[PDB]
């Protein structure tokens, strides 16, 4: 279950109980489509069915012509494996590898082993069910069903070409055109990873797609091969907690904790994700990626329970920005109401049930459903869980608004204290 | 080729050898689709083929009804040309110009000359191959092929309508539906520009789409005309270099160069792009746009070779943020490792090959393939090139951590030096 606590000492909420799934590695698979080489239709006539076939084959030719025209780095592995594929004598190895069945494990020149799927079989249909069936003497097809089937088998290449032209070679997330669900699940169940990671990643294909990349690789020698870059979750089932902060001001000077975001346990340290877009929450997991993360010693947990600890000084922002605002955390809401603005929390049926005063306050989602600040209306999350409210005395009251350095952006607690001491010693 | 250098004096990397392609101008073309006006089907019957035809024509009517419901500015030129089109007596000129062929050059009321292409000919099919073929006496069509052909010719308008409804009138990038590759290439080969810019922009249609805008213009008088806003590259083939910076700290105070991004030569000055998403790199070119750029004197190059130059002071950020991090530049990687965090560089087959010490260090992509910082795993680019490592002494060591102004965000070298001098004079 998910449990939330609210420290009034620093006006900050912590939501714990989450589990982890960290994108730590990249795996590169090579998806190959077997195309066919055709010059032109020998026969010509006024039949409309052959006109439809000619139009469809011309669209296929245009599609195959289009594909011949194509901090950290998120696509470095795919670029490396594409450079490997461009090496001579490598495409033929793949093409001769998965000839009897559409699943192979191949070793390239660089020594890296990759999985190969033959996801489409367009060559067989074009060269064995269109050219021989089409009788060039009469230039007519008896059944329109053949044309309808061609339109039902050539769509996938057209959609792949369209997506690659729109996104300019690299696309994300991988769509159902580029990788069907059955194939994605099969590749997941055959990827070189533990059975623990294969049971968390089969049930969450909704997010594997969002965190995957796909890069156009090769069209040469009647084989359209592109690299799909799946993630490998190297950290699974470790506790994580989200930290939300709100402005805290006197009734002025404002001190806001400036380390909002996700924290996850990782090999004895804490992986810190400041960006909210980085992480995603399905039920109680965080599907974050370490590419947008920092590494911190395992004492940042002490910041949440003691703002004045001596082992790891926290980070704050000091400013005279006296503006009311609210943060809709999970299982509740934090409101900071100052000035003449009216702030309230309203139930769905009992209307206004609170008359928020000046300062920082917190309301659980048990009962409270909407929060009005000024006129802005926020809806609180309705996730079931237990909330705890620890009372205290706001930190900003301990300081004095006479030598307060209301100019910093984010230094630390210790830096603010030493600046205050220097200012006091100056007088 | 691409050449990288790493200055340890400021812990910054420069990647040179790139070429330029700057989006300097906008060109507006008018893409017109000739629709047809139809009231309703006179005949009615229980035949299923006529039901399919009625459904398709009703979808066409709904699509045509939908389109009647529709720092710097990136769409100012298109808005201006649309305002020109809304003027009376202008749509008829376009309609009567491209009457004999689907290519025209027209002069509007404002005097600006624009290219007009008729990309679709739906009116001819609807009014000359559907109404006369459909015999209203029997209300039946002999061949289902006519319906299948209608479904293969009406998809374009449906997709255009869908994209315009989703994106609310303005769309980017121009997808394959709204402008096919052959049409885009013909428009490129007939646009009013030099043959030099027509040979760089034909081979890079993958990026012209991404940097182009398309806006709905007019539906009045059975002509659906929308403006495609292509870019005009006014600066081509000038040297460009990318500048990457990493935190530099003592073993504390941290001084980071704060001018990351692209630099390009431009008419004797330097165009500076701070945003990384602004520029795109296909092989060795930068397809940037000047709308997100600054202009600097041609002495910012001296910042890279002499941090303490007297002609153009550089820009720095001073803070006590002692956090380890890495920057994956092209052809190598910069790693700044501080505190107790473990930082290493690992080969694919030889495993860990380095044991990075505290400070800033740099590893080329020759051999080094992965970089581990804490637990975050980064993959270095595998682009072939030459790396150079110039030794020196870190600039931060020259300062003293006693009067250091660890509060600024980005002032300059000169401002930091004068603040240090003022602090020294105060004592």
């Amino acid at each position: 279950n998910i449990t939330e606590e609210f420290y009034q000492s620093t006006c900050s909420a912590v939501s714990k109980g989450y589990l982890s799934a960290l994108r730590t590695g990249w795996y590169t698979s090579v998806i190959t489509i077997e195309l066919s080489n055709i010059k032109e239709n020998k026969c010509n006539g006024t039949d409309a069915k052959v006109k439809l076939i000619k139009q469809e084959l011309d669209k296929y030719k245009n599609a195959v012509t289009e594909l011949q025209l194509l901090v950290g780095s998120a696509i470095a592995s795919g670029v490396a494996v594409c450079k490997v594929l461009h090496l001579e004598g490598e495409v033929n190895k793949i093409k001769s590898a998965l000839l009897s069945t559409n699943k192979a494990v191949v070793s390239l020149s660089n020594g890296v082993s990759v999985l190969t799927f033959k996801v489409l079989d367009l060559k067989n249909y074009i060269d064995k069910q269109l050219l021989p069936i089409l009788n060039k003497q009469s230039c007519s097809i008896s059944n329109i069903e053949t044309v309808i089937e061609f339109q039902q088998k050539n769509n996938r290449l057209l959609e792949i070409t369209r997506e690659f032209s729109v996104n300019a070679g690299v696309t994300t997330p991988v769509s159902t055109y580029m990788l069907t669900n059955s194939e994605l699940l099969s590749l997941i169940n055959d990827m070189p990873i533990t059975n623990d990671q294969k049971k968390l990643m089969s049930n969450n294909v909704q997010i594997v797609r969002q965190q995957s990349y796909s890069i156009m690789c090769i069209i040469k020698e009647e084989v359209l091969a592109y690299v799909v870059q799946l993630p490998l979750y190297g950290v699974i089932d470790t506790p994580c907690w989200k930290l939300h902060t709100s402005p805290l001001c006197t009734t002025n000077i404002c001190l806001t904790r400036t380390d909002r975001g996700w924290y996850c346990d990782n090999a004895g340290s804490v992986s810190f994700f400041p960006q909210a877009e980085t992480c995603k929450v399905q039920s109680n997991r965080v599907f974050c990626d370490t590419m947008n993360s920092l590494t911190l010693p395992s004492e940042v947990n002490l910041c949440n329970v003691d703002i004045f600890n001596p082992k790891y000084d926290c980070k704050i922002m000091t400013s005279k920005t006296d503006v009311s605002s609210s943060v809709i955390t999970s299982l509740g809401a934090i409101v900071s109401c100052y000035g003449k603005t009216k702030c309230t929390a309203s139930n769905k049926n009992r209307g206004i049930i609170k008359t928020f005063s000046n300062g920082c306050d917190y309301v659980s989602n048990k009962g409270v459903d909407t929060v009005s600040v000024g006129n802005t209306l926020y809806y609180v999350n309705k996730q079931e869980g237990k909330s705890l409210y620890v009372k205290g005395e706001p930190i900003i009251n301990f300081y004095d608004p006479l030598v307060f350095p209301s100019d910093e952006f984010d230094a630390s607690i210790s830096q603010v204290n030493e600046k205050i001491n220097q200012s006091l010693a100056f007088i | 080729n691409i050449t990288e250098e790493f200055y340890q004096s400021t812990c910054s990397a420069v990647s040179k050898g790139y070429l330029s392609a700057l989006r300097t101008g906008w060109y507006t073309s008018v893409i017109t689709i000739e629709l047809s006006n139809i009231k309703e089907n006179k005949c009615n019957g229980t035949d299923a083929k006529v039901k399919l035809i009625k459904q398709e024509l009703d979808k066409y009517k709904n699509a045509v009804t939908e389109l009647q419901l529709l720092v710097g500015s990136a769409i100012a030129s298109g808005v201006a040309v649309c305002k020109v089109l809304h003027l009376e007596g202008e749509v008829n000129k376009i309609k009567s110009a491209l009457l004999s062929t689907n290519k025209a050059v027209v002069s509007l009321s404002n005097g600006v000359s624009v290219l007009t292409f008729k990309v679709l000919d739906l009116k001819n099919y609807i009014d000359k191959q559907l109404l006369p073929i459909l015999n209203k006496q029997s209300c039946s069509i002999s061949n289902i092929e006519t319906v299948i052909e209608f479904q293969q010719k009406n998809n374009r308008l449906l997709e255009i309508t869908r994209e315009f409804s989703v994106n609310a009138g303005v769309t980017t990038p121009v997808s394959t539906y709204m402008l096919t590759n052959s049409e885009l290439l013909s428009l490129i080969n007939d646009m009013p520009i030099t043959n030099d810019q027509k040979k760089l922009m034909s081979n890079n249609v993958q990026i012209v789409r991404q940097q182009s805008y398309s806006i709905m213009c007019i539906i009045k008088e059975e002509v659906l005309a929308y403006v495609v806003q292509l870019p005009l590259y006014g600066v081509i083939d000038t040297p460009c270099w990318k500048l990457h910076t990493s935190p530099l700290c003592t073993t504390n105070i941290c001084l980071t160069r704060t001018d990351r991004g692209w630099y390009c030569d431009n008419a004797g000055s330097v165009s500076f792009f701070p945003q990384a998403e602004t520029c795109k790199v296909q092989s060795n070119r930068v397809f940037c746009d000047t709308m997100n750029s600054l202009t600097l004197p041609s002495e910012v190059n001296l910042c890279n070779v002499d941090i303490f130059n007297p002609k153009y002071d550089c820009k720095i950020m001073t803070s006590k943020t002692d956090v380890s991090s890495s920057v994956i530049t092209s052809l190598g990687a910069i790693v700044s490792c501080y505190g107790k965090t473990k930082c290493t560089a690992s080969n694919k087959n030889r495993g860990i090959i380095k044991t990075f010490s505290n400070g800033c260090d740099y590893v080329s992509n020759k051999g080094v393939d992965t970089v581990s910082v804490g637990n975050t795993l980064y993959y270095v680019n595998k682009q072939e090139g030459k790396s150079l490592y110039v030794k020196g002494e870190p600039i931060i060591n020259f300062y003293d951590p006693l009067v250091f102004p660890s509060d600024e965000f980005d002032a300059s070298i000169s401002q930091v030096n004068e603040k240090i001098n003022q602090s020294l004079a105060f004592i």
Partner: T-cell receptor
Framework: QSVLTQPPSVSGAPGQRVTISCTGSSSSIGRGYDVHWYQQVPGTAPRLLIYANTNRPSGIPDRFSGSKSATSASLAITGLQAEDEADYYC??????????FGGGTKLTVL | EVQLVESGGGLVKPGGSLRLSCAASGFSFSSYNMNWVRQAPGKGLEWVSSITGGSNFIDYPDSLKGRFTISRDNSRNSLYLQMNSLRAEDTGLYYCVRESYFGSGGSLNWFD
């Protein structure tokens, strides 16, 4: 009967390098899972020797080495001494058997 | 200072039930995985049971599936393995071994 195959015993003289092989199938070393080399001196709990198939934990002498290629892994000991006589186990994964472990190589000094 | 001390072993008649406990100290237990591995006297090693940090990814091999039940209690840093319906095998040493990541992604990490 183990998933992987290992020589029953290898021998050598002091100052001589010895190579121990770890061979497996497709759903094995193949597909590139990894191999890990564990040491066991009798009467003592097993100790990690080589992890990630090439690296080395701190506190292990540099004379040890490990590598892999195609479908076979190797562990090389350079400069054999009396303290290296032990049971050596090679480890990898299996899509149908999970953690496999080796059959045990008994290395002794002559 | 990673200490893994295991206890609870003793003589049991065939077909009996048994419990084995493992206490871990000196490291953050809640993030590292755990495993139980066998070693018959004079025979090779053989993996027996696995569990992850969140106690919701259980894993057994095919031969011992449905008999051995593993459960980690995170409150006092404890691991337990319950053995039902013993057979002639399973005799020997049982090791409570911490599965420790941070050797890159690398699937199988490095149980130290």
């Amino acid at each position: 009967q183990s998933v992987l195959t290992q020589p029953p015993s290898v021998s050598g003289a002091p100052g001589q390098r010895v190579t121990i092989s770890c061979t497996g199938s497709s759903s094995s070393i193949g597909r590139g899972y990894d191999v890990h080399w564990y040491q066991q001196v009798p009467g003592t709990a097993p100790r990690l020797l080589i992890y990630a198939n090439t690296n080395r934990p701190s506190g292990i002498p540099d004379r040890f080495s490990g590598s892999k290629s195609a479908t076979s892994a190797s562990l090389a000991i350079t400069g054999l001494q009396a303290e290296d006589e032990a049971d050596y186990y090679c480890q990898s994964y299996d899509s149908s058997m999970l953690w496999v472990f080796g059959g045990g190589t008994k290395l002794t000094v002559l | 200072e990673v200490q893994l001390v295991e206890s609870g072993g003793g003589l049991v008649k065939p077909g009996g039930s048994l419990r084995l406990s493992c206490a871990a100290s000196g490291f953050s237990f809640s993030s590292y995985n755990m495993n139980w591995v066998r070693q018959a006297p004079g025979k090779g090693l053989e993996w027996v049971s696995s569990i992850t940090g969140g106690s919701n990814f259980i894993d057994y091999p095919d031969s011992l599936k449905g008999r051995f039940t593993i459960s980690r209690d995170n409150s006092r840093n404890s691991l337990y393995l319950q053995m039902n319906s013993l057979r002639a095998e399973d005799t020997g040493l049982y090791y409570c071994v911490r599965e420790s990541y941070f050797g890159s992604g690398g699937s199988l990490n490095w149980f130290d």
